[PDB]
């Protein structure tokens with residue numbers, strides 16, 4: 143029963159998920175002046191050529207494009223990561239207005255939306271075991287700003303009509319998530335958590351510096367989704383972002 147409303151939103155989560163007030167919670171503000179270049183970072187490798195997308199799901203909190211993760215078909219390696227992380231899903235967070243919607247912020251700037259590509263460390267065998275580990279997951283975060291359309295996003299946008307309400311899914315095969323990346327893979331990285339309950343502190347965050355542009359019409363279609371289930375009173379799925387959490391004893395490192 144957690145959500146994003148006044149009565150079940152981020153200010154309330156701590157009562158059922160006490161780790162919400164933990165030492166390595168996400169998202170955070172990225173202070174570009176305090177982040178330091180780390181020449182120890184190895185090159186980042188996004189290897190999505192054999193990605194196998196399967197389905198898209200409205201889960202009541204966002205929509206997930208889900209992948210076949212039964213083999214190393216789409217993986218992330220390099221950068222701050224030790225070993226191989228397998229893509230399992232991506233999703234977005236967005237706002238009611240273009241001036242908010244991202245989870246991470248950059249010098250307190252909020253972007254219109256934020257894409258999360260979620261990966262688990264194959265040394266733990268499956269996602270559920272991975273989220274019992276401090277290095278279990280890697281989430282690649284990409285900011286969205288409103289301007290020119292992102293062509294590679296349009297197939298996502300056009301299927302949303304078919305998953306308007308909580309619990310609905312659709313087939314979503316043969317989608318190439320490489321079409322959602324910016325040109326540059328310059329990033330910031332820090333240790334953090336899942337940004338929704340259970341808020342587990344199991345994530346290496348890799349947040350790209352370069353945003354992607356999407357069109358107003360594309361994000362407007364995100365905002366037509368529903369948090370509610372079919373037949374229920376309409377609650378638009380908007381402002382499904384957690385605000386920035388205390389950085390505590392952490393350092394944000396830059397790859398550039």
Ligand SMILES: NS(=O)(=O)c1nc2ccc(O)cc2s1
Pocket residue numbers: 143144145149150151154155156157158159
């Ligand atoms: N702590 S949490 O998981 O954010 C919440 N759970 C409920 C359950 C009922 C309810 O009426 C409100 C909340 S907030």
Ligand SMILES: NS(=O)(=O)c1nc2ccc(O)cc2s1
Pocket residue numbers: 258260281335336337338339340341
């Ligand atoms: N926004 S985020 O940090 O990418 C995520 N949060 C959850 C929560 C549960 C879950 O099962 C998967 C994720 S990914």
Ligand SMILES: [Zn+2]
Pocket residue numbers: 233234235258337
């Ligand atoms: Zn997310």
